[PDB]
Amino acid sequence: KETAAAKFERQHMDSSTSAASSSNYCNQMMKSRNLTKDRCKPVNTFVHESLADVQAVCSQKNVACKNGQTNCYQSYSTMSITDCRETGSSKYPNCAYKTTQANKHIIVACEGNPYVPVHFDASV
Ligand SMILES: Nc1ncnc2c1ncn2[C@@H]1O[C@H](COP(=O)(O)O)[C@@H](O)[C@H]1O
Numbered sequence: 001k002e003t004a005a006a007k008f009e010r011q012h013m014d015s016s017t018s019a020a021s022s023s024n025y026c027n028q029m030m031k032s033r034n035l036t037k038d039r040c041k042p043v044n045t046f047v048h049e050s051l052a053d054v055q056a057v058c059s060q061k062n063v064a065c066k067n068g069q070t071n072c073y074q075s076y077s078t079m080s081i082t083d084c085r086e087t088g089s090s091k092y093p094n095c096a097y098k099t100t101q102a103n104k105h106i107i108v109a110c111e112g113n114p115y116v117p118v119h120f121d122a123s124v
Contacts, residue, residue, distance in 0.1 A: 003111045004111065004118040010120045011035065013047040013054065019080050020093035026084035026097035040086050045120055046104060048080035054117060058110035065121055071109050072121050078103040081123055 002010070013093055017025075026044075035041035047054055057075045067093035083100040090096035102123070109119035 005116045008108075008117045009051070009121065011080070012047055013051060014048055015050055016074070017048055019048055020033070020082040020099045021048075023099055025082060025098040029082075030084055030095060030097055031044060036095040040090055041090045044084045045106075045123060046082045046084070047120075048082065054115045056110070057108050058104060058115050058117060059066070063107060063117075065107075065109055069109065070077075070109060072107055073110060074124065075105045076103070079106050081106065083123070104114045105117075 014029065019025075023027075029046060030036050030041060030044060035044055057073050059073070060068070061078050063072050063073040063074045064070065080103055081101070083102065084097045085100065087096040087098060104123040106120070107122040107124065108117040109121055110116055111118045
């Protein structure tokens, strides 16, 4: 089965690009990462940093999660990320997104042994 850890990597990791590939990036990536499979996933963030760097966030600044759990962590450094947001004109199965690149601190929830990212909570 797909572990939660693998699912985080599929949904949120993109170390290959340093930053968003112009205007087409979200359209292609949301599809290729299977987030347009059974609906247009409305909102999603990709992180353009090494896996090791993202994993290391599980030992950085402990902050409250949006759902009220205590297992969330904020990166001490800013990271290169891309926010994808579904357009008003987007209609399944033709899912359309705005690609917005930025540099922000990420917030991830971590679980397990090893203690790794399983949920992307926020960027700040
Ligand atoms: N603190 C957390 N630790 C682990 N997974 C979480 C956490 N917060 C949210 N999730 C995951 O993200 C989804 C969205 O959370 P919610 O909006 O509370 O339904 C949940 O179904 C979980 O799959």
